[PDB]
Design a protein around this ligand. Structure first.
Ligand SMILES: *[C@@H]1O[C@H](CO)[C@@H](O[C@@H]2O[C@H](CO)[C@@H](O[C@@H]3O[C@H](CO[C@H]4O[C@H](CO)[C@@H](O)[C@H](O)[C@@H]4O)[C@@H](O)[C@H](O[C@H]4O[C@H](CO)[C@@H](O)[C@H](O)[C@@H]4O[C@H]4O[C@H](CO)[C@@H](O)[C@H](O)[C@@H]4O)[C@@H]3O)[C@H](O)[C@H]2NC(C)=O)[C@H](O)[C@H]1NC(C)=O
Ligand SMILES: *[C@@H]1O[C@H](CO)[C@@H](O[C@@H]2O[C@H](CO)[C@@H](O)[C@H](O)[C@H]2NC(C)=O)[C@H](O)[C@H]1NC(C)=O
Ligand SMILES: *[C@@H]1O[C@H](CO)[C@@H](O[C@@H]2O[C@H](CO)[C@@H](O)[C@H](O)[C@H]2NC(C)=O)[C@H](O)[C@H]1NC(C)=O
Lengths: 218, 145
């Protein structure tokens, strides 16, 4: 099974350049029936196709971004990368790399077979800041407060992924300080409060921070 | 056998009838499924005299991912089909493509007074076949007025 994984910086300063790399796994990038492309999704907007390349090197871009975007492929490393020059604030989006399957007798008929996970790219001159995790001590509810981090995103797990039911990870909110604040809670029965232990696995990739906070009552 | 008489060699005419009149799919998606690329086959051409007014015509440009167009260079005698109701402008891609584009049904890519085995680059065409028939000078004048 094909599986694509993005690997970008997450934060790029204005007027600088953005570089993301998409590594294909479970299958060779040097296949006749596949094109490899990039699609970005701005906050609260639709999907915008940036470009696409063939394993030989045949590039193809969207007219608006053709002046900036340059997508290259690396057969020896089994990956393809996007380079968007002169990045601006309007390019803050979630960049998805996708696998475009093509089959055809006369010309290829395309549909984007497999998609990537997505990279939250934020175009800002502000510096990176790691988060601070605080417990929300307590059917009773308990959670964690991930305050003062930049940029997005933050992924919060519970009990190393074992606890999943009834977990609500709220969307981040930008404070007046320019930093984001996130909250993730879970509703568990009151009887299990004393017996079972609860930990939230907060992870902030842009700052390379992984915090395992233990939430206890009182 | 002795039925019918041919006076001059100008009276024998070849009429090209579009596949549109045969009530086949005119959509370019289903029409693109009727063609394919194959190497090792020479392209042949036959000239005809009359043709039908086409319902849908196609101006296709299938290119390599590098940009190389895979369709053959049209010879000088090849020109756009005269009468088309709608002309679909299509730009395709095919990296694996080899050889030249042929018709899977055995039909011909109809050009102006020419039927071709291959689809030529940057030239409007329509799918169809031709038929041999005899109409004398007086009968031909009546149909076209
Ligand atoms: C004069 O006018 C007539 C009628 O207008 C016209 O007849 C048409 O001929 C063409 C062939 O030249 C016919 O096209 C074939 O259609 C059949 C039937 O398709 C139906 O059934 C399939 C399957 O049930 C459905 O999915 C489909 O939706 C339809 O309902 C197909 O079976 C044919 O495909 C096979 O042959 C192709 C040849 O090019 C292959 O490319 C294709 O892969 C198919 O191969 C099969 O066998 C392979 C090995 O056995 C296998 O690998 C394949 O996977 C597949 O199983 C073909 O598309 C068309 O239907 C006819 N039209 C009508 C209305 O009947 C004449 O052509 C025309 N004459 C001239 C000179 O123009
Ligand atoms: C079909 O497409 C071809 C090419 O895409 C068109 O040919 C172009 O015509 C313009 C105007 O005459 C020229 O400036 C270009 O140089 C031509 N390009 C090529 C590659 O020949 C052709 O005009 C199209 N036909 C129709 C009816 O639209
Ligand atoms: C074109 O064909 C018509 C019809 O076949 C020809 O008219 C016939 O002419 C013969 C000889 O004069 C008569 O015996 C027939 O009765 C005519 N038929 C009809 C329907 O009128 C006509 O002569 C032909 N024209 C040419 C130039 O050969």
């Amino acid at each position: 099974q094909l599986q694509l994984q993005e690997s970008g910086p997450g934060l790029v300063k204005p007027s600088e350049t953005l570089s993301l790399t998409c590594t294909v796994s479970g299958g060779s990038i040097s296949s006749s029936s596949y094109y490899w492309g990039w699609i970005r999704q701005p906050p609260g907007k639709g999907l915008e196709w940036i470009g696409s390349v063939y394993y030989s090197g045949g590039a193809s871009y969207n007219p608006s971004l053709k002046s900036r975007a340059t997508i290259s492929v690396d057969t020896s490393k089994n990956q393809f990368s996007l380079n968007l020059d002169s990045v601006s604030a309007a390019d803050t989006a979630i960049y998805y790399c996708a696998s475009i399957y093509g089959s055809g007798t006369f010309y290829y008929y395309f549909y984007m077979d497999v998609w990537g996970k997505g990279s939250t790219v934020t175009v800002s001159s502000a510096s990176t800041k790691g988060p601070s995790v605080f417990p929300l001590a307590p059917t009773a509810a308990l959670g964690c407060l991930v305050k003062d981090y930049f940029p997005e995103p933050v992924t919060v797990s519970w009990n190393s992924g074992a606890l999943t039911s009834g977990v609500h990870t709220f969307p981040a909110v930008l404070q007046s300080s320019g930093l984001y604040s996130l909250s993730s809670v879970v509703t568990v029965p009151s009887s299990s409060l004393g017996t079972q232990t609860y930990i939230c696995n907060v992870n902030h990739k842009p700052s390379n921070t992984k915090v395992d906070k233990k939430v206890e009552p009182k | 056998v002795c039925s019918g008489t041919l006076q001059k060699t100008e009276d024998v005419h070849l009429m090209g009838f579009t596949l549109s009149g045969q009530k086949v799919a005119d959509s370019p998606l289903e029409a693109s499924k009727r063609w394919a690329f194959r190497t090792g086959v020479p392209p042949k051409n036959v000239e005809y005299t009359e043709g039908e007014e086409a319902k849908t015509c196609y101006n296709i440009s299938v290119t390599d991912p590098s940009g190389k167009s895979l369709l053959l260079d049209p010879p000088s005698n090849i020109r756009d089909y005269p009468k088309c109701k709608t002309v679909h402008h299509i730009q395709g891609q095919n990296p694996h493509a080899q050889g030249i584009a042929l018709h899977l049904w055995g039909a011909f890519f109809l050009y102006d007074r020419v039927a071709s085995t291959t689809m030529y680059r940057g030239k409007v065409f329509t799918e169809g076949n031709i038929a041999a028939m005899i109409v004398n000078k007086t009968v031909h004048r009546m149909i076209f007025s």
